[PDB]
Amino acid sequence: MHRIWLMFDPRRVMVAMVGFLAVLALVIHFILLSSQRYSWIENGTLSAAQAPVGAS
Amino acid sequence: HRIWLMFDPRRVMVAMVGFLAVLALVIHFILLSSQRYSWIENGTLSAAQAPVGASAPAA
Amino acid sequence: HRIWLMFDPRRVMVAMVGFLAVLALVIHFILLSSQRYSWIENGTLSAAQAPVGA
Amino acid sequence: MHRIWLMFDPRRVMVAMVGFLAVLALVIHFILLSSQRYSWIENGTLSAAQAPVGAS
Amino acid sequence: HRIWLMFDPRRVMVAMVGFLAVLALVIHFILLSSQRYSWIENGTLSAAQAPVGASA
Amino acid sequence: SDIKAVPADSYNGSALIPTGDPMIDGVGPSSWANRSDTPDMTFHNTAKIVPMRLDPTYSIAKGDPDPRGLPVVAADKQVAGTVIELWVNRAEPQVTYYEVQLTGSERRVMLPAGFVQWPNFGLWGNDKLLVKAITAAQFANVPALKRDDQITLLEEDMVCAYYAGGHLYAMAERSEPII
Amino acid sequence: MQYIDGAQIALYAFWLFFFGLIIYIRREDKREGYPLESPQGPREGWPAMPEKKTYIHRPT
Amino acid sequence: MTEDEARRFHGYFVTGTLGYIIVAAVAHFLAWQWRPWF
Amino acid sequence: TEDEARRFHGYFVTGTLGYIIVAAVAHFLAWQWRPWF
Amino acid sequence: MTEDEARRFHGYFVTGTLGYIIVAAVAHFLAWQWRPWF
Amino acid sequence: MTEDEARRFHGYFVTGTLGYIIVAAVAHFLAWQWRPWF
Amino acid sequence: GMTEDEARRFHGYFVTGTLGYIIVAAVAHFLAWQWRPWF
Amino acid sequence: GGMTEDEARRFHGYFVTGTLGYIIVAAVAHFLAWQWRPWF
Amino acid sequence: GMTEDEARRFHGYFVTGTLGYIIVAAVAHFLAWQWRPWF
Amino acid sequence: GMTEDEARRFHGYFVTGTLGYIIVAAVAHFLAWQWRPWF
Amino acid sequence: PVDPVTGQTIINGEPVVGRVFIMQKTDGTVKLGKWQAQYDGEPTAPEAANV
Amino acid sequence: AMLSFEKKYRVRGGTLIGGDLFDFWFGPFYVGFFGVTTIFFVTLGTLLCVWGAAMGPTWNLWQISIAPPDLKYGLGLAPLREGGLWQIITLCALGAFGSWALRQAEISRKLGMGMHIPWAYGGAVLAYATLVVIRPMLLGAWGHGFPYGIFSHLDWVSNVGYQYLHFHYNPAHMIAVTFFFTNCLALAMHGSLILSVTNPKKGTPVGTSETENVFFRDLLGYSIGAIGIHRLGLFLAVGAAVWSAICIVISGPFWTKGWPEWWNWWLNLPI
Amino acid sequence: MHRIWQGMDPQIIMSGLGFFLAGLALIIHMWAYSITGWPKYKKAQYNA
C-alpha cells in the first residue's frame, strides 16, 4: 500500500498527476465546446428537449 | 499546512499567479469570441435580446 | 509587510509596471478596433447613436 | 520622494523612460495618421463640421 | 549641468544627431509620399489648388 | 563535500554557492575535466602543441602582426604582461597559446588564443592583445606546467577552464543580474 | 485495397523505420554521463543506456 | 523555513485564497443577473 | 532590513490603492460617455 | 547614489516631468479646439 | 571630466539646441505661408 | 500564535460582536418584511 | 512592530470619534436626500 | 537645499509676488467683464 | 521624517488651511446656487 | 417557427428567451469528405485530347 | 536526475533578470525569469490554439487552421472570430520566441560559454518576425501573415508564391535555396567525416585531425579547418534564414510584378 | 469553546471574516434586488 511511496517519490508523482489532470480537464472541456449539443457558451440556456441531437 | 516544507512558497506563488493569469485571459478571450458574450459590442442588450445558439431544424 | 523580505521590491515593481503597460495596451487596442468603441472615428457620437452588436 | 533614486539607477530609468515615450508618441501619431478623421496631412484644413465621422 | 556628469556628451550628441537626421528624413519622405505636400510635382500650385482630403 | 560548494537552501534544484574562491577550486564555469596526464601526440608520435622555439620551421604569415613583445591589456585596462613566445598546433598549423611574461617578470603564464581579441577586430592598428576574461591580478594564479616545452591534456583543460571561469568570477558585478 | 494504397503503406514503413532509427540514436546519446544520479538512485530513460564502448589507439 | 514562519505564511495564503474566491463568486453572481448561461 | 520593508510597504500600498481609485474614476468617466452594459 | 544627490536629482526630474506634462496638456487643448474627439 | 567644462559644454549645448529650434520655427513659418496644414 | 489568556478574551469579543451583528441584521429583516414580504 | 498597546489604545479613541462623526454627518446627508427624492 | 533662515526671506518675496500677480489679474478680469460679460 | 514637535505645529497649519479652503469653496457654491440652482 | 404573439422562437414546442441564431463553425466551413465528393458542383470530366 | 559530471556545474549566477528566486532547475530544465516567461506565453498561446481548433469545423490535426484577419482590418486588432485570435497567438509566439532566446543566453553565461547559440537562434526568429510582423506592416495589414495550420500554411505559401507567377525567378530566393542545399551537403560531409575517423575500418586505430585534412585534400584538393567547418556550417545555416527573410520581404513591399520580368535589367545591359 | 482560537493570528481572522461578510452581503443584496424589484419600480417613478 503505502510502500509505493518507497518506490515512487511523492513529489514527482504529484506533479505528474496534477499535470495529467489539468490536460485531461482542458481537453474534455474543449471537446464539449466544439460540439453542437454541449456548446454551453452558445446554447447553454436551452432545455434538454431543445438541445441538438445527432442525426439518426 | 506542511505543503510549504516540501515546496518553496516563493516558487509556488509565482506558479500560481502565472496559472491564474493564463486561465483568466483564456476565459475572457473565449467569451469575446462567442456571439452571446461578445460584451464589447453587445453588452448593452438585455437577456431577452441576447443571442442564443441553436441547431438547424429538421425541415 | 514581510512579503518584501521574500520578493525584491525593486524587481517586483519593474515586473508589475511591465505587466500593466502590456495589459493597458491590449485593452486599448481591443476597444480601438471594435465597432462600438472606435473612439478615434466615432468618439463624437452620443450613446444612442453608438453601434450595438446584434 | 527623492528616496526612489536610491533604489533605481537614474541613468537606466531615464534611458528606459525616454525610449518608451518616443515609441509611444510615434505609435499614437501613426494611429491618427492612419485614421480617416485625423489624417491631418491630407484633410488637415477641414473644419470640425466637415471632418469624417464613423458610422452610427 | 550635472546631467553631463551622468551622461557622456559624445554619446548623447551622436545619438541625438542620429535621431534627428532619421526623424527629418522620415517626415520629408512622408510629405513627399502624400498628395497635398508632394512638393516636387505640385509645389507650384497655390493653397487653393492644393489637394485636400475628402470630407467623408 | 569534495566540490567546495554548498546549496543555497534546502529546496531541491537550487543552485550551489562556492565556499572558497571558485577560480582555483574549479567550480561552475571554472570546472575542468580529469583528462589524461599525457601530452597529445601528432601522427608521428610527437608533441602536438609546442613552442615555436622548439621547431624553427614554423613562422608567421606575411601581413599578420607578430604578437611577441606586445602588451597584454586585461579586463582592468591595465597591462598584465608581454607576449614572448607562441605555442602552435603541429597537427593543424595554428596558434594555440601565448606565453606571457608578467610585468615584474619572475614567472611566465600561458594564455589560450581563444580569449585573445585584437583592437578594432584586427582591422586597424594591432598594438596590443585584449583579454576580457581575467584581470591583471589573476594572471598570476593561472596554473603552471610541469615542463617548459610540452603541455598535457590535463593542464590544457586547467588553463582553459581557469580563463573561461573568469567571465563569471573576475568581479562581483559579472555574477549579478543587470536589472 | 480501395482505401489502402501504396503511398500510405510506404509512409507507414518509413514511420516504423524512423522510430527505430530514433531509438538507436537515443541509445547512442547515452554513452557519456550515464547512469543519471538522483536521490532515489540510478536512473535511465528509454531507451536504456548501451554497453560500454571502447576505442582503439595507435601504439607508441 | 522555520515552522514559526511556516505558520505565518499559511495564514495569509489561506486568507488571500479565500478573498480571491469570494470576489470571483461576487463577479459570477453579477454576470448571472446580467446574462445567465443556463 | 525588516524596518525598511515596513516603510516601503506603506508606499507600495498607498500607490497601489491610489492607482486603482484613479482607474475607477476613469471608468466612471467612460461610463458617462458610453456605457458598455 | 547618496541622499544628497538623490534630492538634487529629484528636484530637476520632478520639474522636467512637470514641464513635460503641461506642454502635452496645452497640445491636447489646442487639438480639442481644432477637432474634438468626443 | 572635471565638472567645470560640463558647465562650459552646457552653455554651448543649450544655445545650439535653442538656436536650432528657433531656426526650425522660422522654417515652419515659411511653410505655413506657402501651404497651411490647418 | 495566540496564548490561552488572549484566546478567551478574543472569544468574548467575537461572541459579543457576532451576537450584536445578528440582532442588528434581525431588525433589518423585520423592516424589510413589512415593506415587501418575500413569501 | 508598530502601534503598541499604549499607541493602539489612543488610536482606537480617535478612530471611534472619527467613525461617529462620519456617521452623524452622513445621516444628515441622507435626511436631506430623503426630503428631496425618497427612494422607497 | 535652502536652510531655515533663507526660507523665511524666500517666503516673504514669494507671498508678495503672489499678491501682486492676483491684483493685476483682478483688474484684468474687471476690464474683461465690462467688455464682454461671460455670465 | 518629522517629529512630535514638528507634527504638532504642522497640524495647526494644516487645519487652518483645510478650514479656510472650505469657506471660500462654500462661497463658491453659494454664488453658483444663486446663479443656476442645480436641484 | 415564431410565436404569433410574443415573437419568441419556438424549438420543439418550447419558447426561447433570446434572439436565436443557427450555430455554425468558422465562416460556415464544412469538413471535407471523400475525394470523389470534391467533384460535385464542378464541371464534368474533360473530353479526350485532339491528337 | 543529473549527469555523472553535472553537479559541480549547477551554480548560481549568470542571469539577466532575477536572483536566487529564479535560479533553480525543474528536473533537467533550467528555470530562469525567462523560463517563467516562456511557460506563460507557451501555455497561453497553445490554449488559444486549442480554442481555435474547437471553433473550427474539425479536430483533425492536419486540417486545423487558425487564419489571420481580412485585409480590410488593416493593422487593427480584428474581432476574435474574424482573425483577432490569430493576432493574439502571434503575440504569444513572439513573446515565447524572445524569451527562449534570452533564456539560452542565461544558460551559456552560467556555463562560461560564448553567445553564439542565442544569436544563431535569432536568425530563425528574424525570419518569423519578417513573415508576420515586418512584411505585413510594410504592406499595411496583419492579414498578410500566414495561417497557423499544418497543411493550411502550405496553401498560403503556394498562393503567395504564385502571386508573382513564378517564385523560382526571385533572385534572393535563388540565393537562399543555394544556402539551404549547400548546408545540407556540408552537414552530410561533416557528419560523415567525424564518424568515419571515430568509427574507422574494423580493427584499425581511431584516426587523427591529419586524417581528415589529408582525406579532403585527396578528394577535393582543399580541406577546411576543424574550426572552419563549424564556422561554415553556422554561416550556411543562418545565412539561409537571413536570405529567406530578404526574399519574402522584397516580394510585395518592393516588387509587385512577376519575378521573371525582374530580369529585364540583365537583358538591357548596354553591351 | 475558546480553545479553537489557539495559535491563530487575530488580525488574519478578522480580515477573513471581513471578506466573507462583504462578499455574502453583496450577493444577497443583488439577490434581494431581483426578488423585491426595489430600484426598478422607484427608478421608473423618477425617470418617466
Added chain:
Amino acid sequence: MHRIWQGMDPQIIMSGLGFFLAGLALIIHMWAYSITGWPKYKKAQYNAQ
C-alpha cells in the same frame, strides 16, 4: 477592543480606509444617480434654453 490595532501601521489603516470609503462612495453615487435620475433631469432643463 483596542488590541485589534496592535502590531499594525496606522498609515496602512488610513490608506485602506480611504480606499474603502472612496471606492464605496463612487459605487453608491453611481447607484444614487441612476435611481433619482438627478443630473439627467436638471441638465435637461438647462440644455433646452
Added chain:
Amino acid sequence: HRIWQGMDPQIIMSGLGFFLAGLALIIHMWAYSITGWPKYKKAQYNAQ
C-alpha cells in the same frame, strides 16, 4: 495630530495638491455639462 509623525510634509502637500487638482478638474467638467454654462454664453456671442 500624532498621525503626521514620520511623514514628509512635502510628500503630503504633493499628494494633497494632486488630489485637489484632479478632483476640481473632474467636478468642473461635471458642472459644465449640468449647468450648460459655456454653451449658452458662447452661443450668444457666436450668433453674429
Added chain:
Amino acid sequence: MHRIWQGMDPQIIMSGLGFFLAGLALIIHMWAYSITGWPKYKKAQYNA
C-alpha cells in the same frame, strides 16, 4: 509658513511655478477666446 520651503532649491520652485502659470494661462486664453469669440468677430470685420 516659511518652513514648507526648507530644503528646496529656489530655482526649482520658480521654474516649476512658471511652467504651471504659462501652461495654465495658455489654456485659459484658448478657453476665453472660444467663449467670448473675440478674434473671430474682429478678424471677420477686417476681412470683409
Added chain:
Amino acid sequence: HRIWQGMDPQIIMSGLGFFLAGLALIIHMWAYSITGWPKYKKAQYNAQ
C-alpha cells in the same frame, strides 16, 4: 472517540466547512427549482 487523535482540529473544521457550504448550496439550488419560490415571488413584484 480515538478517531480524532493525531488529527488537526482546524483541518477537521475547515473540511467540514467545505462539505457543509458546498452541500448547502447544491440543495438550495435543488430547493429553488422544486418549490419555484423566487420565481413566483419575483413575478408578482416584477410584473406590476
